[PDB]
Design an enzyme around this catalytic site. Structure first.
Site, PDB file in Angstrom:
ATOM      1  N   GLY K   9      32.653  37.925  38.226  1.00 35.61           N
ATOM      2  CA  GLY K   9      33.420  37.974  36.996  1.00 35.61           C
ATOM      3  C   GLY K   9      33.858  39.384  36.659  1.00 35.61           C
ATOM      4  N   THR K  10      34.848  39.897  37.378  1.00 33.71           N
ATOM      5  CA  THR K  10      35.208  41.304  37.334  1.00 33.71           C
ATOM      6  C   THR K  10      36.556  41.500  36.643  1.00 33.71           C
ATOM      7  OG1 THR K  10      36.419  41.433  39.423  1.00 33.71           O
ATOM      8  CG2 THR K  10      34.023  41.418  39.536  1.00 33.71           C
ATOM      9  N   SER K  11      36.996  42.756  36.614  1.00 31.56           N
ATOM     10  CA  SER K  11      38.336  43.130  36.179  1.00 31.56           C
ATOM     11  C   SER K  11      38.920  44.062  37.229  1.00 31.56           C
ATOM     12  CB  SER K  11      38.314  43.805  34.805  1.00 31.56           C
ATOM     13  OG  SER K  11      37.913  42.900  33.794  1.00 31.56           O
TER      14      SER K  11
END
Lengths: 52, 224, 193, 142, 210, 250, 209, 192, 205, 142, 205
Positions: K9-11
């Site tokens: 769950g990254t950016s």
């Protein structure tokens, strides 16, 4: 239906070819050619009586 | 495969007197997100065939790879590969339909709907459809997805039977296709205002138009 | 299918119901749930459809091959061990099937009768008496069994068990075929249970 | 360019699919006695209720090897996978030890497993037909 | 799980005459309530005076017809261009259908032709190869409407044995017109293939398009 | 070595799945070897649960359902003159017209008869295959095959596919010199049961009233079979002797 | 009182063992429908009237459960007639919309009726769509039924603000005709009803064929 | 003997006459056609619901005659049946009803059919109810002709019933047929 | 939440500025992928200067809004013009007390002489939050950053109009459930002003 | 401020919950003969397998009325709901027609249903105890 | 996709600018609501000037990246420095051919003398798209509008750094699965430059 006499003879000859490449491209199956000859006598509706 | 992720909506097509016309929008959706703008979904094969693909984008790119490989293998050790041994629309459709049915039978399908359009070497129009189940059919007008429910009724009013084909000019067919695309942009939530169109004519060859936009939109009666 | 077995002082008595499959009416007079493994070792089997018959025929073929090859007869203990091994092997890669076998024999090296029971998972137990297929005959066996009972007393106990079984079953229960294994081999009690 | 093995399921079945145990009386049917599987194992039961990881584990090394060969074909050309396959075939073909099951040293050198151990190495593992002559017949195809 | 089957509901009808056979079908190809096409033929000439139709899931029927025609090509190659009889074709189709016993074609198959004595013959197949020779059989969505019409018109009422080709064609057309009036999935067009000693002839008629 | 090079020399064929010999044979690309297999090849879906797939997709609108054989009463029994087989010949009706009488008894060869129950296609296909196997066996051994051997062949065949979806119940009846007259019952569960009297189908209890003795004449046996079928309820009668089966019709 | 719930458990135990359009024009509204009535794939009736009358100048056409549509329309018509008698005034389309919305919301979507309601009242011309769960919407042109997509395509092709009565009638007829040709659910005829401000409602049975 | 659920009902219109017919079980009582003066109702489906509906409609028609001092007409009875069926919206009877009759004042024949919650299907040619035979509808479609005389209408409906019964269950099948005119009602039995 | 029920996949914004408040929305109502209505008006008036936008179930929100309008008429008959806080409280009570049976979310924008323009948001569940500006709907998720980078207190009317137009244009661009025209209501001391912007205008921003 | 009726399920049960049909021989048990429900209806069966919309429909009007009373209390004060409830109680209390089931005109005027029809109006609807005296006993509580 | 498997769950952002390309990411790895690692490095190097960021299953993406790095070493042994297009093609083939068993998405940023900086995105499914800039991860949904309003072609290095910093700060602000520090790699003709920004710096933007 009954198989034609010539068709059966062709199948037998295709089997006999197995000391080399097969009629349909199969790999070699026998180490040496057969040492026997055949006389095939048949009757079919298409060609009457036949001897091969 | 086994689920679509990035998809395109619909492709529409019709026959006219001297050729065929096909069209499709330039959007790749990611569910409700209109993620990718600038996806070309009309693939020109040879100088005489256009393939329109709707559905899974990754499978569409796989099909594009297959079509390019088919074109390359046609010219392998072929001197007249572009003069008399060029690919026909029927050959391409037969290969694609065989692939689609075989991958359906493997329980490993390609989630796409495909329309092949073009002109045969004798001048005959070719327009046929295949899908992920391997179902194929032909008709003077064809469409996939939402278009099949809204574009086909509009296009059949211009070309309703075979005898209507010789009576339809390129201008009328192109106008009908443009109006159908405008209606789809009105009523399809996964559609885009940008679309590409392709005309295949037995005289003028292939004309590919990109960056076409829906125009003349009646957003005026919403004031009251 | 119900099978019963009692090991008396000098022999083993095996009783198998001459039942039939459901949905087809059959008139036959034979013991189809019993295979002679060796001239002094008998096997009775109960369970589901042809899987059990296939297993029994496979066991019989293997044991006959051993007897022909060695010109000798395996003891009942070795036969039961081989059957247990084969039954355990047959379900190592498939869903288990319902099967229960009673092996009764007369060992001539030891000159004594032996009885074994193997269930569907391949558990072999040596017992003086046993049964399978009955929903009680256990108490009747416990109260009226002695190690030094003769063949006649074992037959009387078997008849009592058969009567107890038949008192709670319909008339569709045609009867039970009884066989005896002793020092003279395997014979069939053609009179009654 | 596969990582997890694919296309592991069987697409067609027949009663004579296992050519090595065909019955001599009925050549279209298998010989259950020489199968030595317990005598109650129909082939259909092998098509259902399998552990999902069994096919992945059984074909893992072959899949990795095929991916390596495909990479060699893409980067080096046809000759490199051709030569690797030829070497492996030559090594595997001339090894015939009916009394042993361990792999050869040269095979491990070719597979770059000289100093590598997996559970297949730790755990490498009848009445009828488990002798030298059965292995001779299978090896020679007679 | 992915569902590999579909439905393209149509109607077919095969009738055996005294020295002729007819196989007819509606040309409507539909999906749910939509119309895929109004002229998509489903009755094909397979060579050697044999007409075939496989109604139901269109992809499976197309595959079956393709396989049968390729097998006929090889039969001609391997047997000195011998003519394939209708019973041999029925046996071949039975084997082709039963080859998919555990993953069957979702079709119902009718073939028609002339037997060895020159009489008309029609064979009907179940999805997994069970087949029988019949005088008349209707299949598809509107079979339960077409069959009573023929039963009222003909006696299996002038006997079927003394009917001509034109009368049979008229009966088929009338039955299909009635079914089109009553059934939503029937309409657009009707195509009939007639097999006689001179070969195969095609006729087409229009039906209501609503 | 050049075969290895061809294996590593190049996509389209892979997508067509025609790099496999079985696919080429099934589509008759390289010839008609598909129609030359003594043991038929059966297609299965390449998934983890073929059985569940088939069961779900078979138990569900058009006429494309798998045809089921008649549940009509069938009787077979044996006496000193041979075997009597009687089948109630009431024919079900549908959207079709029969060209001639529909046979519920399969003629395996001029000496063997089988009875259909369950799946019609399964019974017909596998009994024709059994007839081919029996013919090959008799050609090889130069002697007529016993009923036990043929019934065992069919039983082994159906057992190899047990649980896949086959549904069939048949009675193999035959008269040989060594065995006399013999009747076996074989079903898709692998059961193989030798017997004297068999009654299968609806009304089997009524037909099981067979007055039966091993001294009945041919006419008496035919009359008894006809009466038993009528009590179960036209009737089709078969009399199997050492010289073959004879069809009477009644 | 009211709709009964008796034999619900018994029925559970036993179980365990069209194209409609509405178009506004400069002086009124038009509603149109097809006449094909089917029971599954079988055409039960080739001439069925699907346009219903809530009040002399308020009409509607429905889809979904046919019995529910008819019953709800009749109940609202009775309420409208009583309210008009009570107030001594011409009924308004807004009042019928309110009654329908609240009645459908009371039953929480269990009454399967989807409606197009057109009407003319002293306040003007009105066109509404009504969903089974109780939501309502306003529009200048609406479509409903299995053939609603083809009809909506035709309507989007040839709709404009300045429409005369004849143009509106032709447009509605063309939309119904498209639904007739391209949808298996429609096909027989076209029924029209024109409601114009200041005039009586005009009911045209079998306008096309 | 106690299994009477199901059955078929056929109603047809001729010239100044109607016909309503139903299937009847074998011998060794339960008829699915009832009348309320000059309106005939045939109900297919669950037998208990058929009996319940017959009793309820007898109740309501008796009260209607007592109040209005006149017999009820087919159209009014059709509306009453529809409303009564809709009352059980969520617990509906498992029935298919068919109504036939002749209006006294006008003389026009009338037939109608209902779904399980009272939706009315008014047909000008014929109504078929029940799921015993799928080809019964096709046979009625192939045999029906508009504006038939009472004898011709009786022959047509009887032939339709006989042909439906022939390709279906047999050995005890019977039929009950009613021919209704403006002033004469004829009831006949068919043992074929 | 109910099976086969109309949902509200909209784009809703409400911004407080120097002279009052502005409420803006798109005009798209869809059923799955089909656009059921492309010119729907989503700006609901519950009082002369108290407006709202709705999300969730369409029927539930319409019923709640009708009850709130009736309640505010009753209140006005007694004490005159209600405050935005009172309307927000009534909305919150109706949403919270029925949260087990109805799915509803409401954005309320109001103006009054005392508080001079207010915004309240009631998301699913029934909690209430007072904010200088609020966004809601399926298309709001794509403009969380942009708004946070472009909102200022006490903006002029034109700046607020531009901010709302840009934000809703982006929301329409990225959300498939949002589209059509942009409708706004401006509530100040001067009165109520309605504004509409067409796709050919905001798509070129 | 409820819209959909809430708190419709019963929290406690007892064999004497229905006070009007209690047995005289065993006052702790109900009188099945005077219940006239078919004689095979235990109370527990009424706690399960109910249609989910039945409770919503049965209590809809009461819920709307309670919401209206709560709104009046919030906006007008206690006196307005007090007076509405008093008027309704007075009207309902003095109406006793054992031979009729229709509501009074004055009740409909108070409920603002003078010109409104619902399915309860269209469909308003033994051996033992269905007479005038049972209604007298229930009304008077004797 | 697998039960009890670590997700990403990254950016992720990748921006092309005048002198080359810049790849940026956050540094948060979470298991449900618990933060398993707050200083994880998400910038994966597959070649000296070819870097990537991963989304989906962590194990599958790590295996794919290792195979890609091995493939690029093999390619370099033959023909020298590979192009970004070749690495993107290898990534796409690995992702597409195994999409029925592995869940993987890859953003690839590269520089070479011929093409002068390129960005490719391979979302779930295995399709490939070449873009002037790309965003991915659970936190990207909140910055779709902002980026569309603030990207320009041929920006300078500092402008690109600021754009990425602002966008990732907003993504961290609104996404619970994103947080920590911002890590960037700048790929130009001069070389590879690594940058890190701390919360106390970008939270005041």
């Amino acid at each position: 239906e009954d198989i034609n006499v010539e068709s059966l003879t062709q199948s037998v000859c295709d089997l006999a070819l197995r000391f080399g490449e097969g009629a349909s491209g199969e790999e070699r199956l026998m180490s040496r050619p057969f040492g026997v000859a055949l006389l095939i006598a048949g009757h079919d509706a298409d060609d009457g009586y036949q001897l091969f | 495969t086994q689920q679509p992720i990035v998809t395109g909506t619909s492709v529409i097509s019709m026959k006219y007197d001297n050729g065929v016309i096909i069209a499709a929008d330039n959007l790749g959706s990611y569910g409700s997100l209109l993620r990718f703008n600038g996806v070309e979904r009309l693939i020109p094969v040879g100088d005489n065939t256009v393939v329109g693909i709707s559905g899974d984008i990754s499978d569409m790119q796989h099909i594009e790879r297959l079509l390019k490989d088919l074109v390359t293998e046609n010219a392998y050790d072929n001197p007249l590969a572009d003069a008399e041994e060029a690919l026909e629309p029927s050959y391409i459709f037969e290969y694609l339909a065989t692939v689609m049915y075989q991958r359906r039978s493997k329980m490993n399908p390609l989630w796409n709907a495909i329309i092949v359009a073009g002109v045969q070497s004798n001048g005959d129009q070719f327009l046929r459809y295949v899908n992920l189940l391997g179902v194929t059919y032909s008709s003077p007008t064809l469409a996939t997805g939402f278009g099949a429910h809204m574009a086909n009724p509009l296009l059949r009013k211009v070309v309703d039977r075979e005898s209507d084909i010789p009576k339809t000019t390129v201008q009328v067919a192109e106008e009908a296709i443009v109006n159908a695309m405008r209606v789809l942009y009105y009523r399809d939530a996964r559609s885009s205002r940008n679309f590409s169109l392709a005309i295949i004519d037995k005289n003028t060859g292939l004309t590919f138009k990109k960056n076409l936009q829906v125009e003349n939109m009646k957003w005026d009666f919403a004031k009251d | 299918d119900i099978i019963l077995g009692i090991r008396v002082q000098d022999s083993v008595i095996l009783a198998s119901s001459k039942a039939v499959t459901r949905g087809i009416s059959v008139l036959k007079d034979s013991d189809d749930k019993t295979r002679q493994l060796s001239p002094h070792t008998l096997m009775s089997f109960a369970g589901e459809a042809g899987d059990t018959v296939q297993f029994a025929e496979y066991i019989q073929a293997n044991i006959q091959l051993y007897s022909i090859r060695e010109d000798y007869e395996l003891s009942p203990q070795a036969v039961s061990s081989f059957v247990r091994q084969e039954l355990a092997k047959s379900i190592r890669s498939r869903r288990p099937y319902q099967v229960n076998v009673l092996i009764g024999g007369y060992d001539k090296k030891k000159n004594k009768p032996e009885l074994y029971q193997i269930d569907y998972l391949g558990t072999k137990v040596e017992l003086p008496y046993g049964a399978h297929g009955y929903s009680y005959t256990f108490f009747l066996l416990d109260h009226h069994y002695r190690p030094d009972m003769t063949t006649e007393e074992g037959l009387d106990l078997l008849k009592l068990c058969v009567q107890e079984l038949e008192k709670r079953m319909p008339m569709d229960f045609k009867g039970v075929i009884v066989k005896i294994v002793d020092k003279d081999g395997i014979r069939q009690v053609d009179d009654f249970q | 360019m596969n990582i997890v093995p694919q296309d592991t399921f069987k697409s067609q079945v027949s009663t004579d699919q296992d050519k090595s145990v065909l019955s001599s009386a009925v050549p279209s049917l298998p010989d259950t006695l020489r199968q030595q599987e317990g005598g109650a194992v129909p082939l259909s039961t092998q098509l259902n209720d399998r552990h999902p990881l069994e096919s992945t584990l059984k074909n893992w090394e072959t899949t990795q090897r095929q991916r390596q060969m495909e990479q060699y074909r893409q980067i080096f050309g046809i000759a490199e996978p051709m030569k690797r396959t030829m070497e492996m075939e030559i090594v595997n073909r001339t090894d015939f030890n009916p009394l042993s099951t361990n792999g050869s040293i040269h095979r491990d050198i070719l597979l770059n497993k000289e100093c590598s151990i997996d559970w297949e190495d730790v755990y490498p593992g009848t009445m009828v037909g488990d002798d030298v002559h059965s292995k001779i017949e299978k090896q020679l195809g007679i | 799980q992915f569902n590999p089957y579909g439905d393209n509901g149509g109607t077919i009808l095969g009738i055996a005459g005294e020295d002729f056979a007819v196989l007819a079908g509606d040309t409507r190809n539909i999906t749910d309530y939509s119309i895929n096409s109004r002229y998509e033929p489903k009755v094909f000439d397979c060579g050697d005076n044999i007409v075939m139709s496989a109604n139901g899931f269109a992809a499976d029927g197309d595959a079956l017809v393709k396989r049968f025609k390729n097998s006929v090509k090889w039969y001609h190659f391997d047997h000195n261009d011998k003519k394939l009889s209708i019973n041999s074709a029925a046996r071949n189709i039975q084997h082709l259908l039963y080859g998919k016993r555990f993953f069957p074609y979702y079709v119902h198959t009718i073939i028609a032709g002339l037997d060895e004595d020159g009489k008309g013959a029609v064979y009907s197949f179940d999805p997994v190869g069970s087949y029988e020779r019949e005088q008349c059989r209707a299949g598809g969505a509107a079979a339960s409407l077409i069959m009573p019409f023929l039963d009222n018109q003909v006696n299996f009422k002038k006997p079927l044995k003394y009917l001509s080709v034109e009368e049979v064609i008229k009966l088929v057309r009338d039955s299909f017109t009635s079914a089109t009036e009553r059934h939503i999935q029937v309409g657009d067009g009707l195509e009939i293939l007639i097999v006689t000693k001179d070969g195969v002839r095609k006729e087409f008629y229009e039906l209501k398009r609503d | 070595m050049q075969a290895i090079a061809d294996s590593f020399s190049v996509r389209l064929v892979k997508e067509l799945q025609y790099d496999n010999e079985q696919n080429l044979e099934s589509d008759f690309v390289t010839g008609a070897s598909q129609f030359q297999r003594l043991a038929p090849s059966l297609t299965v879906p390449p998934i983890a649960s073929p059985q569940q797939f088939l069961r779900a997709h078979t138990d569900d609108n058009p006429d494309c359902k798998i045809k089921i054989a008649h549940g009509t009463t069938t009787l077979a029994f044996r006496f000193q003159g041979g075997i009597i087989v009687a089948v109630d010949s009431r024919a079900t009706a549908g959207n079709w017209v029969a060209s001639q009488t529909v046979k519920k008894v399969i003629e395996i060869n001029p000496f063997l008869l089988g009875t259909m129950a369950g799946g019609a296609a399964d019974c017909q296909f596998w009994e024709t295959w059994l007839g081919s196997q029996c013919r090959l066996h008799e050609l090889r051994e130069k002697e007529r095959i016993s009923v036990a051997a043929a019934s065992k062949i069919l039983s082994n065949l159906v057992y190899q596919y047990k649980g896949a979806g086959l549904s069939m119940g048949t009675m193999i009846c035959g008269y040989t010199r060594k065995e006399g007259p013999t009747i076996y019952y074989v079903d898709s569960d692998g059961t193989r049961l030798k017997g004297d009297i068999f009654c299968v189908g609806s009304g089997q209890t009524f037909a099981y009233g067979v007055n039966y003795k091993w001294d009945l004449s041919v006419e008496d046996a035919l009359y008894l079979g006809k009466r038993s079928i009528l009590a179960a309820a036209s009737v089709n009668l078969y009399h199997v002797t050492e010289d073959g089966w004879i069809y009477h019709g009644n | 009182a009211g709709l009964s719930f008796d034999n619900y458990q018994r029925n559970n135990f036993l179980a365990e063992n069209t194209t409609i359009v509405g178009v506004k024009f400069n002086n009124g509204v038009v509603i149109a429908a097809d006449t094909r009535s089917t029971q599954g794939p079988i055409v039960a009736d080739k001439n069925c009237a699907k346009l219903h009358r809530i009040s002399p100048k308020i009409w509607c056409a429905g889809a979904g459960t046919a019995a529910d549509t008819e019953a709800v329309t009749q109940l609202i018509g009775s309420n409208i007639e009583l309210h008009s008698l009570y107030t001594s005034r011409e009924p308004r389309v807004v009042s019928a919309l309110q009654m329908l919305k609240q009645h459908l919301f009371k039953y929480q979507g269990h009454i399967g009726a989807y409606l197009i309601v057109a009407g003319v009242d002293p306040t003007g011309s009105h066109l509404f769509s009504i969903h089974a769960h109780g939501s309502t919407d306003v529009g200048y042109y609406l479509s409903l039924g299995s053939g609603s997509l083809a009809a909506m395509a035709v309507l989007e092709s040839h709709w404009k603000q300045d429409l005369t009565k004849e143009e509106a009638i032709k447009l509605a007829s063309d939309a119904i005709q498209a639904g007739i040709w391209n949808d298996l659910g429609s096909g027989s005829n076209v029924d029209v009803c024109v409601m114009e401000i200041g005039k009586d409602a005009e009911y045209l049975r079998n306008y096309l064929t | 003997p106690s299994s009477i659920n199901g059955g078929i009902v056929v109603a047809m219109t001729g010239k100044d006459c109607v016909a309503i017919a139903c299937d009847l079980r074998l011998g060794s009582k339960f008829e699915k056609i009832f009348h309320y003066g000059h309106v005939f109702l045939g109900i297919t489906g669950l037998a208990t619901d058929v009996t319940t509906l017959n009793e309820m409609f007898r109740y309501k028609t008796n009260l209607y005659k007592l109040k209005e001092e006149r017999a009820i007409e087919p159209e009014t009875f059709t509306q009453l049946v529809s409303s009564s069926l809709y009352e059980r919206r969520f617990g509906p009877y498992f029935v298919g009803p068919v109504v036939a009759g002749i209006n006294s004042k006008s003389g026009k024949p009338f037939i109608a059919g209902f779904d399980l919650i009272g939706c009315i299907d008014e047909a000008k040619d014929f109504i078929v109810s029940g799921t015993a035979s799928d080809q019964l509808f096709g046979m009625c479609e192939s045999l029906y002709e508009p504006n038939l005389e009472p004898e011709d209408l009786f022959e047509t409906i009887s032939q339709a019933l006989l042909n439906a019964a022939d390709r279906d269950a047999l050995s005890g099948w019977g039929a009950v047929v009613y021919i209704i005119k403006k002033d004469e009602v004829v009831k006949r039995y068919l043992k074929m | 939440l109910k099976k086969g029920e109309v949902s509200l996949g909209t784009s809703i914004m409400a911004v407080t500025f120097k002279d009052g408040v502005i409420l803006g929305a798109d005009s798209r109502t869809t059923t799955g992928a089909y656009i059921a209505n492309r010119v729907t008006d989503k700006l609901t008036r519950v009082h002369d200067k108290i407006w709202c936008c709705r999300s969730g179930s369409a029927a539930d929100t319409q019923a709640i809004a009708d009850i709130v309008q009736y309640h505010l008429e009753l209140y006005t008959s007694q004490y005159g013009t209600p405050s935005t806080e009172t309307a927000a409280s009534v909305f919150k009570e109706l949403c919270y007390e029925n949260k087990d049976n109805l799915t509803a979310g409401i954005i309320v924008a109001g103006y009054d002489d005392k508080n001079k323009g207010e915004v309240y948001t009631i998301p699913l569940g029934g909690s209430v939050h007072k904010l200088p500006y609020a966004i809601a709907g399926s298309g709001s998720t794509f403009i969380y950053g942009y708004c946070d980078k472009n909102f200022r207190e006490n903006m002029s009317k034109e700046e607020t109009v531009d901010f709302i137009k840009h934000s809703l244009s982006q929301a329409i661009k990225w959300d498939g459930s949002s589209g059509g025209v942009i409708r706004m209501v401006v509530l100040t001391a001067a009165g109520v002003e309605r504004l509409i912007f067409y796709p050919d205008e905001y798509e070129q921003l």
